[PDB]
Amino acid sequence: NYQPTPEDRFTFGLWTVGWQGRDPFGDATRPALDPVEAVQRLAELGAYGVTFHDDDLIPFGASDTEREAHVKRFRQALDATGMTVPMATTNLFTHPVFKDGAFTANDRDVRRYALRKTIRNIDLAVELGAKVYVAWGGREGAESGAAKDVRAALDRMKEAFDLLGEYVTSQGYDIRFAIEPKPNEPRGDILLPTIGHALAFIERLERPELYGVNPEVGHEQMAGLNFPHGIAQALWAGKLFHIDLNGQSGIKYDQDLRFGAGDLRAAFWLVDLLESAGWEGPRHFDFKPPRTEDIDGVWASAAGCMRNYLILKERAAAFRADPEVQEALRAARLDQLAEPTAADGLQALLADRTAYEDFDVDAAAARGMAFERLDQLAMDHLLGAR
Amino acid sequence: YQPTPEDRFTFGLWTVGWQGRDPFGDATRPALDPVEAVQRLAELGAYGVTFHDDDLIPFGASDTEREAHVKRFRQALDATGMTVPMATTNLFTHPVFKDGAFTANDRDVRRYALRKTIRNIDLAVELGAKVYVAWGGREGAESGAAKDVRAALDRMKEAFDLLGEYVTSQGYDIRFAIEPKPNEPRGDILLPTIGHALAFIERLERPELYGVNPEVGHEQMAGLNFPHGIAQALWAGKLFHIDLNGQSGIKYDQDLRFGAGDLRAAFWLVDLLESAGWEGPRHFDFKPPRTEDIDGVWASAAGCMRNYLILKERAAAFRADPEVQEALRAARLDQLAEPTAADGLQALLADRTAYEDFDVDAAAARGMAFERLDQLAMDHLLGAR
Amino acid sequence: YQPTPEDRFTFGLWTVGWQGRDPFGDATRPALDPVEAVQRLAELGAYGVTFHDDDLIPFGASDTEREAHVKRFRQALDATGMTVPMATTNLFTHPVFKDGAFTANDRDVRRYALRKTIRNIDLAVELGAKVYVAWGGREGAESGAAKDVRAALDRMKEAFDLLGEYVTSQGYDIRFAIEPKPNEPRGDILLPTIGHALAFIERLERPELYGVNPEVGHEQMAGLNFPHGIAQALWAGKLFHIDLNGQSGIKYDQDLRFGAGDLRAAFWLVDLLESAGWEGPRHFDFKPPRTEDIDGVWASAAGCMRNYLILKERAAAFRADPEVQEALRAARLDQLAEPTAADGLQALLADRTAYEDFDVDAAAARGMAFERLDQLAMDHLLGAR
Amino acid sequence: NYQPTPEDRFTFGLWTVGWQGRDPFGDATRPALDPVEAVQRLAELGAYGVTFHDDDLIPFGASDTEREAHVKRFRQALDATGMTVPMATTNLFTHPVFKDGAFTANDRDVRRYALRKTIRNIDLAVELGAKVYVAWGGREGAESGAAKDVRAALDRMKEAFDLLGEYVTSQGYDIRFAIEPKPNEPRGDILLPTIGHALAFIERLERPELYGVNPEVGHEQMAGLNFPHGIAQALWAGKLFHIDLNGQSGIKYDQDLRFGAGDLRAAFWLVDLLESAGWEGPRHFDFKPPRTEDIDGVWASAAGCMRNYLILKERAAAFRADPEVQEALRAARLDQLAEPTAADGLQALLADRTAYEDFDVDAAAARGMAFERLDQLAMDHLLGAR
Ligand SMILES: [Co+2]
Ligand SMILES: [Co+2]
Ligand SMILES: [Co+2]
Ligand SMILES: [Co+2]
Ligand SMILES: [Mg+2]
Ligand SMILES: [Mg+2]
Ligand SMILES: [Mg+2]
Ligand SMILES: [Mg+2]
Structure with missing residues (x-):
């Protein structure tokens, strides 16, 4: 069978199974979930750990005593169950104060508070043992063209991120940052809308080695992009610091379906x-059990992500592992794709008549790629029909 | 609103030269002589033209036919005073490129592409072009095992680094611009957006030589905000060239005349x-619709510039409107340009006004005044002020 | 461009009354008293307002509280001269409707919905409304076995036919308008477009009683051309009401002020x-962005009408431009309005000029002159003629 | 195994496996396919029949002798193999004469020729035994707002369709028409863009009983719509006269992937x-083997549609058939969805206090729908993991 165990390293955001089902047209359909109950039940399902936004763990506005009490109760549940906390993030989108952004709010006083x-x-996060700190700039953006000078907003975003890197560096913390792109919702257009824009932005930070990406399946698909391809570019760059797994059925609002739902072939x-x-x-799930589900449907959904x-x-x-697939991969020349084009160097390339005057373009054009048979073997394996 | 060469408007030879052949329909106009394209665009007030290798010289031409075609194009440039600011290679039409060019699985094809x-x-250098554009239209895939994207990025980096070595070794003053496109003609194309192309550049051996050539319609085919993407390329110092056109939504690549499609984004x-x-x-990469005859082709081109x-x-x-400047201050656009924490990290951590004494409810009650600002922008666009 | 009540502009109470709560964020404005909405909209030059049951009367109110709320709204209508042309039911906010209302799997919920x-x-009749709108926001599904769509269409037809029996039996002069939406808040909503709603109407017991209430943003969330969809509803005689707003692309339902989003489609x-x-x-169903304070809410509403x-x-x-009329004739728009074959089927079959002697190459060479016509339209929109 | 046989009723358009791979940016990558070779090889793969546009069978402009010779050769191949021709259509989109439309071209002379x-x-089509005649109005539409008066174009479209129905009726032919919607491509917007618009239009024809729809998987998905839902509405209406099966990976150009590729869960x-x-x-496939494939990859693709x-x-x-699934269906109240809401009638409904004053909304709101577990059983069955 397909029974998850903590060795699989599956993690869930507290806000996932804790989502009360309030949407923009509907009230909450489930009662608030205690984070301790979340830790306990996810451990029972075979999860490895949980993640949190500050405000999922500590009530916004808590005194220091309440903050300590909440953190202590949470840590007792982690310690009883052996659950970890690999990742943390800040809620810089719920409160009305962030309605124009946090790090890129036009009001400087809000940017300072956000930091x-x-x-x-x-x-x-360091106290709990988190090794990655995620930033999801979901209010960073605009609904109209004059409301946000995007060059100046990238200056502010770079400034915020540099100051956070300086903080971590001055404290000696072993934590790295992961930026989560999203193309729109809840703003008309969000800054750093895709894996690409986020990776490019990182290369202009003071200490780029401290920053990577936290791509979400559904976010890339909201722009109609190929999520495996984006992930391959993050991997190629050495910047895949964390991931959010879920599902999305098309270009539309952010659905956060359980992983495997949505575009199954992409999964x-x-x-x-x-x-x-x-x-x-x-393998971290950022999904929302649909508001149609009761608490048992919540745990079924969570179990279904892992399954x-x-x-x-x-x-x-x-x-x-299938030698028929490996033979189909060679018939499609996947092996050659991994060979250097010109390890002989530019001068040898420029001298090589087989690469130009003697290159038979018509014979080369006649070769089929044999991709359809290869894709059908992939479909047979996915469906258990080999 | 009459264009003149001072506006620096340019057109690809293949734009006004498009014969109207689409995936479902044959050509509706005959082939356009590049010399006639140059004279007619000049009459329209254009500044220059751009070309793929195969737009100027028939694929397969002997060295003699190649020289004769080149010389003849050059005489038309010299006669009219038109320039050639940018050139590119056709690495997509011939069937040899069906699986890509710099990222073809077949090594012989990748070497031939280079x-x-x-x-x-x-x-391009002979003709005076300062930007060389790469549009990887066939770099991509329709299925998941067909292309190992990590290996393809290695081949793409290798090809671009070889090109950079080449230009440096020859002492050419020319820079490269990569044109992103999310899909079409491949199911997914590599470097699908401005951001992915910007990120890829940062890992080349000589990143200073490479920028982007973003096209309005391409970003909009992924539902993205083209002015935001251009703002990131400008902030990066990488906007080496631009393709102007229109697109109406997430669908096939329409290449409408500039202004059509998303008019507020334009x-x-x-x-x-x-x-x-x-x-x-200001370069246009657009296709006069196949409904048009040759006079409609020139109407469409004039419309881009107009x-x-x-x-x-x-x-x-x-x-320039003092009311708009006031509305920008009301919306705190001036504050967005001010450093968040010029005082530095230690002073920000010590500042009670940024945390314990920050009155979050008072701040939350402040309106942004964005709707009034946007309606002023609308009034200006429509000439209703 | 000052609106007056002669323009017949109307607004939902829930538009200017939106508190700014979204799926990721709390309310940014306090609740708006419907009486204050009526007076402020009247000042802005509006003609009327529209309402869901729950916008006027708190869900769960006793018959006394209900009468008191209704009477108080009516006095504000009579004082200002504002009308109520349309009403609708909230069948989406309360958790009892999470699986739908007329198509809930649970029969008790479907009966309660009715x-x-x-x-x-x-x-609605008491208040003078002539159109009753149905927006099935929760009719739909996130997964394939959750909803048998053939059975759901049977329940939807049954609910609408029961409503039709009701209105007929009471002798009410009121018509129904179905508002399509492709998705949000359900993964897919039933009757997702103008066409699906038009087709569904044709199978009701009293189809003459039912039309559509299409919303600009809803058709555009499926990438469709809203003016084309409205043209089909007008050709059908079914455009009973309209929701005006803006939307920028295929993404979540933005409900921008009218004019924003796709400006050329507007x-x-x-x-x-x-x-x-x-x-x-001319009814607006839009949401003033949650960035706005109450003055921004009224700016946004004024902007819709402007x-x-x-x-x-x-x-x-x-x-009215004689040059545009000439360009329309050049593009043969007059011929599009002429019957193809008034002569009838037998005469068309006998006409050699329609087949053996039809000079297809000569016809194919004719340009449509659409680009010039469209650039005249652009010049007019921008006031650049 | 999963071996197709003619009892499965799988059909292919000649233009599918015959697609030469010419796209808007690329030349043809395969040679023209003889329709007789198509019939023979599809029969070998277990197909039941083929479909055609006029111009796939008879060269445009053929004399009567050539037209008869082409048809006779085609019929000999059908008769040798036992293949059928269930459906036919006209090519009213390739020739430049149709660049503004066929039935709705602004030029009346073109509309007459198109008819x-x-x-x-x-x-x-009647001679070959086809029972359905498909109309795909792919050039019917516009790229700009003033170029097409859509009301007048629907008048012309209704006129064309009425004249075709009168023709069939006057000849006594047993053939019915199936309109194929498509939202855009190659026009900016196409008239009758979806199953819905096409079904609505039919209800205004003179003889609506003669017309249904031919929906294509990828076309509905090009508008981000749910294809099974659209098909259910066509079925509910009694108007599903034919279908085009293929795949599409998102909102983008019309990909015509082999069936099962694209949105696998939707398939x-x-x-x-x-x-x-x-x-x-x-079960008719309207797909395009990718231009990367040689002729063997073409037959693999075709075989893969059926598989x-x-x-x-x-x-x-x-x-x-799974009793655990049927129990999950009842737990989700799918059985109640099929029960009349109010077979007792309007008067009894209006008298029934359990439907209003005594309806306990809070108890009803508390019930979960159990959709996630039901969907996970569906995922397990699709993947062969029960
Ligand atoms: Co999400
Ligand atoms: Co383009
Ligand atoms: Co809406
Ligand atoms: Co198709
Ligand atoms: Mg996330
Ligand atoms: Mg371009
Ligand atoms: Mg509405
Ligand atoms: Mg088709």
Whole structure:
């Protein structure tokens, strides 16, 4: 079978299984979930750990005594269960004060507050043992063209991130940052809308080695992009610091379906890529059990994220191990794609008549790529029909 | 709103030259002689033209036919005073490129692709072009095992680093611009957006040589905000060239004349390029619809330049209006340009006004005054002020 | 471009009353008293307002509280002269409707939904409304086995036929308008477009009683052309009401003020409604962004009406221009209005000029002159003629 | 196994496996395919029949002798192989004469020609035994707002369709029409963009009983719509006269991937719906083997369409037959959805206090729908992991 165990490193955001089902047209359909109950039940399902926004753990506005009491109760639940906390983030989107952004709010007083709120939670993240601190700039953006000077907003975003890197560096903390792109919602357009924009922005920070990306399946798909391809570019760059796994059925609002729902073939190729690459990060789910579900449907959904990952892993492993698939991969020249084009160097290339005057373009054009048969073997393996 | 060569408007030879053949339909216009394209665009007030190698010289031409074609194009440039600011290679039409060019799985094809590009770089330099564009239209895949994207990025980096070595070794003053596109003609294309292309550049051996050539319609095919993407390329110092056109939504690549499609995005784009003082060519990569005859082709081209000029006038008026400046201050755009924490990290951590004494409810009650600002922008665009 | 009640502009109470709560963020404005909405909209030059049952009367109110709330709203209508042309039921906010209302899998919920609607129809009639809108926001599914769509269509038909029996039996002069939406808040909503709603109507017991209430943003969330969809509803005689707003692309339902989003589609929409002489209310269903304070809410509402009026002026000028009329004839728009074969089937089959002697190459060479026509439309929209 | 046989009623357009791979940026990558070779090889793969546009069978401009010679050679191949021709259509989009439309071209002379071309092919369709005649108005539309008066274009479209219905009726032919919606491409916006618009338009024809729809998987998905839901509405209306099966990976150009590629979960629910409904039409593939493939990759692709249909049919059948799934369906109240809301009638409903004053909304709101567990059983069956 497909039973998850903590060795699989599956993690969940507290706000996932804790989502009360309030949407923009509907009230809450489930009662608030105690974080301690979340830790306990996810451990029972075979999870490895949980993640949190500051405000999922400590009530906004808590005195120091309440903050300590909440953190202490949470840590007792982690310690009883053996659950970890690999990742933390700040809620810089719920409160009305962030309605124009946090790090890129036009009001400087809000930007300063946003940094202080984040810094206090970095300290908490280190205390809990989190190794990655995620930033999701969901209010960073605009609905109209004059409301945000995007060059100046990138200056402010770079300034915020540099100050956070200086903080971590001055404290000696072992924590790294992961930026989560999203193209829109809740703003009309969000800054750093894709894996690409976020990776490019990182290269202009003071201490770029401290920053990577936290890509979410559904966010890339909201722009109609190929999520496995984006993940491959993050991997190629050495910047895949964390991931959010879920599902999305098209270009529309952010659905956060359980992983495996949505674009099932994309989920298979994503699992094939993470496993083939030997990526060792947490398999973290950022999903919302639909508001139609009661608390039992919540745990079914959570269990289903893990189950789908493990089925897909089994199928992708069987695909790569199949000598008929490996022969189809060679027939499609995947092996040549991994060979240098010109290890002989530019001068040898420029001298080589087989690369130009003697290159038979018509014979080369006649060769089929044999991609359809290869894709059908992949479909057979995914469906268990080999 | 009459264009003149001072506006630096340019067109690809393949834009006005498009014969109207689409995936469902045959050509509706005959082939256009590149010399006639140059004279007609000059009459329209254009500044220059751009070309793929195969637009100028028939694929497969002997060295003699190649020289004769080149010389003949050059005489038309010299006669009219038109320039050639940018060149590119056709690495997509011939069936040999069906699985890609710099990222073809077949190594022989990748080597041939590089040889074909280098030949054309030499011509681009001869003709005066300062930007060499790469549009990887066939780099990509329709299925998940067909292309190992990590290996493809290694081949793409290798090809671009070889091109950079080439230009440096020859002492050419030419820079590369990568044109992103999310899909079409491949199911997914590599470097699908401005951001992915910017990120990829940062890992080349000589990153200073490479920028982006973003196309309005391409970003909009992924539902992205083109002026925001251009703002990130300008902030990065990487906007080496631009393709102007229109697109109406997430669907096939329409290449409508500039101004059509998303008209408010075109207004903001013009405001941004003008406000930033970007000095590159205003290049159109558009296709006159196949419904049009040759006179409609020139109407469409004139319309590109006319729309740009009207939008330019409306954006300048927006910025020059004292009421708009007041509305910008009301919306705190001036504060967005001020450092968050010039006082530094230690002073910010010590500042009670940024945390314990920050009155969050008072701050939350402040309106942004964005709707009034945007309606002023709308009034200016529509000439209703 | 000052609105007056002669323009018949109307607003939902829930538009200017939106508190700014979104799926990621709490309310940014306090609740708006419906009486204050009526007075402020009247000051702005509006003609009327519309309401869900729950916008006027708190869900769960006793018969006494209900009468007191209703009477108080009516006095504000009578004082200002504002009208109520349309009413609708809230069948989406309360958790009991999480799986739908007329198509909930649970039969008790479907019966309760119908009872709740019928109560509100009675109020709609009392208040003078002539259109009753149904927006099935929760009719739909996130997963394939959750909803048998054939059975759901049977329940939807049953609910609408029961409503029709009700209105007929009471002798009410009121018509129903179904509002399509492709998705949000459900993964897919039933009757996702204008066409699906039009087709569904044709199978009701009393189809004459039912029309559509299409919303600009809803059609555009499926990447569809809103003026084309409205043209089909007008051709069908089914455009009973309209929701005006803006949307920028395929993404979540933005409900921007009208004019924002797709500005050229807004121009064509206004041209169509004006040209057709459609006489329904110009109703806005938009949300002032949560960035705005209460003054920004009224700026946004004024902007809806202002944009409509500027677009109206530009469309009328386009149509009145003798150069545009000439360009329309050049493009053969007059021929599109002429019967293809008034001579009938037998005469068409006997006509050699329609087949053996039809000179297809000569016909194919004719340009459509669409780009020049469209650039005249652009010049008119931008006031650049 | 999953071996197709003619009893499965799988059909292919000649232009599918015959697609030469010419796209808007690329030349043809395969040589022209002889229709006789198409019939022979599809029969070898287990197909039941083929479909055609007039111009796939007879060269445009053929003399009567050439037209008869082409038709006779084609019929000899059908007769040798036992292949059928269930459906025919007209090519009213390739030639430059149709660049502004056919039935809705602004030029009346083109509209008249378009009708004559179509009528001549209806006669041919009856001769070959086709029972459905498809209309795909792919050039009917516009790129700009003033170029097409959509009300007048619907008048012309209704006029064209009425004249075709009068033709069929006057000839006594047993053929019915199926309109194929598409939202855009190659025009900026196409008239009758979806199943809904096409079904609505039909209700205004003179003889609506003669017309239904031919929906294509990828076309509905190009508008981000749910194809199984659209098909359910066509079925509910009694208007599903034919179908085009293929795949599409998102909102983008029309990809015509082999069936099962693209949105795999949508393909499963489509198969579940066609089979559960007992729909008896041809399972017709309108796909394009990618231009990367040689002729062997073409036949692999075609074989893969049929294979995927049969795997999905097996899995959907196993899903519906599973008593654990049927119990999950009842737990989600799917049985109640099929019960009349108010068979007691309006008066009894209006008298029934349990439907209003005594309806306990809070108790009803508390019930979960149990949709996630039900969807996870569906995922397990699709993946062969029960
Ligand atoms: Co999300
Ligand atoms: Co383009
Ligand atoms: Co809306
Ligand atoms: Co298609
Ligand atoms: Mg996330
Ligand atoms: Mg371009
Ligand atoms: Mg509405
Ligand atoms: Mg088709």
